[PDB]
């Protein structure tokens, strides 16, 4: 079988959804990419979609600090 | 976001998602306590 090389790309998302509600996302990741920018990555609950939230929002601010802990 | 924070993992670089979504509309809120600038 084979497996995608992975990692070889630039930015997972260059756009952000600036107004995501903590209510519509079940899981996030903090994309602190040295390659691109500080990105907020989230998975929608009902939509299940992988989207990115803008890091300048309010609830992401608390997320930022605590996400560094994994 | 959960209560005091969220506590999620820190991603260096990964391929769970390679392309940006259809999310074109982007305008961050500000305060959300008095008002969030966007009401709903």
UniProtKB/Swiss-Prot annotation, chain A:
Changing residue 4 to G: Abolished CXCR4 activation ability, but only slightly impaired binding to the receptor. Heparin binds at residues 22-32, 43, 50, 66. Changing residue 43 to A: No effect on CXCR4 activation. Changing residue 51 to A: Impaired CXCR4 activation. It comes from the Eukaryota. The record marks 27 as: Important for dimer formation. A motif (Receptor activation motif) lies at residues 3-4. Changing residue 10 to Q: Greatly impaired chemotactic activity and enhanced inhibition by heparin. Changing residue 41 to A: Impaired CXCR4 activation. Changing residue 9 to A: Impaired CXCR4 activation ability, but only slightly impaired binding to the receptor. Changing residue 66 to A: No effect on CXCR4 activation. Disulfide bonds join 11-36, 13-52. The record marks 26, 29, 45 as: Important for integrin interaction and activation. Changing residue 22 to A: No effect on CXCR4 activation. Residues 20-22, 29-31, 41-51 are annotated as: Receptor binding. This is SDF-1-alpha(3-67). It comes from Homo sapiens. The gene is CXCL12. The chain holds residues 22 to 89 of 93 of the full protein.
Swiss-Prot record, chain B:
Glycans are attached at residues 13, 20. It is found in: Cell membrane; Cell junction; Early endosome; Late endosome. Changing residue 23 to F: Sulfate incorporation greatly reduced. Sulfate incorporation greatly reduced. No sulfate incorporation and binding SDF-1alpha greatly reduced. Residues 3-23 are annotated as: Important for chemokine binding, signaling and HIV-1 coreceptor activity. Changing residue 10 to A: No effect on sulfate incorporation. Induction: (Microbial infection) May be down-regulated by Human cytomegalovirus/HHV-5. (Microbial infection) May be down-regulated by HIV-1 tat. Residues 3-40 are extracellular. Phosphorylated on agonist stimulation. Rapidly phosphorylated on serine and threonine residues in the C-terminal. Ubiquitinated after ligand binding, leading to its degradation. Ubiquitinated by ITCH at the cell membrane on agonist stimulation. The ubiquitin-dependent mechanism, endosomal sorting complex required for transport (ESCRT), then targets CXCR4 for lysosomal degradation. This process is dependent also on prior Ser-/Thr-phosphorylation in the C-terminal of CXCR4. Also binding of ARRB1 to STAM negatively regulates CXCR4 sorting to lysosomes though modulating ubiquitination of SFR5S. It comes from the Eukaryota. It is linked to WHIM syndrome 1: An autosomal dominant immunologic disease characterized by neutropenia, hypogammaglobulinemia and extensive human papillomavirus (HPV) infection. Despite the peripheral neutropenia, bone marrow aspirates from affected individuals contain abundant mature myeloid cells, a condition termed myelokathexis. The amino-terminus is critical for ligand binding. Residues in all four extracellular regions contribute to HIV-1 coreceptor activity. Plerixafor (AMD3100), an antagonist of CXCR4 activity, blocks HIV-1 entry, interaction with CXCL12 and subsequent CXCR4 signaling. Belongs to the G-protein coupled receptor 1 family. This is C-X-C chemokine receptor type 4. It comes from Homo sapiens. The lineage of its organism: Eukaryota, Metazoa, Chordata, Craniata, Vertebrata. The chain holds residues 1 to 38 of 352 of the full protein.
